[PDB]
């Protein structure tokens, strides 16, 4: 349950086969226990039996990418963090060049 839970928290889709061999279980058993955890609700998504994929709720689109545009403002801030962070010669020279020039 916790292994399927960690596979849920990290996906957005996985086949019954890739989740089965992911957690060393049969693919039909992966579908079975995965549907039993969606029955338990602690797994969430949508199951395509015919295509053989337990999709998670993928939750990714263009307004989510607009939230990622505000996160791109905060990743220009994280670019300032890379300026101050990644290499010390890069720390000195990038804090000079990208910020003061």
């Amino acid at each position: 349950e916790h292994n399927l839970l960690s596979a849920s928290k990290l996906y957005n889709n996985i086949t019954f086969e890739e989740l089965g061999a992911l957690l060393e279980i049969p693919a039909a058993k992966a579908e079975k226990i995965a549907s039993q955890m969606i029955t338990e609700g602690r797994m969430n998504g949508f199951i395509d039996q015919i295509d053989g994929i337990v999709h998670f709720e993928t939750r990714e689109a263009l307004p989510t990418w607009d939230k990622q545009i505000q996160s791109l403002c905060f990743q220009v801030n994280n670019l300032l963090e890379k300026i101050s962070q990644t290499a010390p010669e890069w720390t000195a020279q990038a804090m000079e060049a990208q910020m003061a020039q």
Partner: protein, 215 residues
């Protein structure tokens, strides 16, 4: 010491004073403890010191090769250049894998699984998503597993390295995208100078009509 995206925060003055006082083989030990520093795999202002300059091209010229690899190169470079660079740990070999893979996802919206399976020499799904989940688990990676596209969904990337100068190309790509969003928004600006300026004209004239309706 200082804190934003970087490896273990000791490293800056750590290896400053190390290369300052540890040199030759002491410099090699310097480098060996440098090796685990993820977010600073490149040492632009840390190779600023002549102690690292002799770190480079000294006994550890292969290590400056590796450092520039972090700046420029990839792990699949090592997959070809298996002997050029200094030794690495399997953890650190996977770290260079993560070099090239974070650079790739830096490139694409989502890099394919087979892409890193082949360039990074990754054989199968298990180890593949092992190093994948550990990369994301570093929190460098946002997004999720793009399985259907056989990719990795990417919403956010923390800076991998200091990545010796793309500086020119870096700032000019910045100028590019800045101007691109600018021109999108400026076309919007003049569409606004159209529409509700057009709204001013339209309602003004329509009200002129309505006023002239009387007599």
């Amino acid at each position: 010491m200082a804190g934003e995206q970087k490896p273990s925060s000791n490293l800056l003055e750590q290896f400053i004073l190390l290369a300052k006082g540890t040199s030759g083989s002491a410099l090699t030990a310097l480098i060996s403890q440098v090796l685990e520093a993820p977010g600073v795999y490149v040492f632009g202002e840390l190779l600023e010191l002549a102690n690292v300059q002799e770190l480079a091209e000294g006994a550890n010229a292969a290590y400056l090769q590796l450092l520039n690899l972090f700046a420029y190169g990839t792990y699949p470079d090592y997959i070809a250049n298996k002997e050029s660079l200094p030794e690495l740990s399997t953890a650190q070999q996977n770290k260079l894998k993560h070099l090239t893979i974070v650079s790739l996802a830096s490139r694409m919206k989502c890099i394919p699984y087979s892409v890193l399976l082949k360039d990074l020499e990754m054989r199968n799904l298990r180890e593949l998503e092992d190093l994948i989940i550990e990369a994301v688990y570093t929190d460098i990676i946002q997004g999720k597993l793009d399985q259907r596209n056989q990719l990795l969904e990417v919403d956010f990337c923390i800076g991998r390295d200091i990545r010796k100068k793309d500086l020119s190309a870096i700032a000019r790509t910045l100028q590019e995208w800045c101007v691109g969003c600018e021109v999108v928004l400026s076309g919007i600006e003049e569409q606004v100078s159209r529409a509700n300026q057009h709204k001013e004209q339209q309602l003004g004239l329509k009200q002129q009509i309505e006023s002239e309706v009387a007599n």
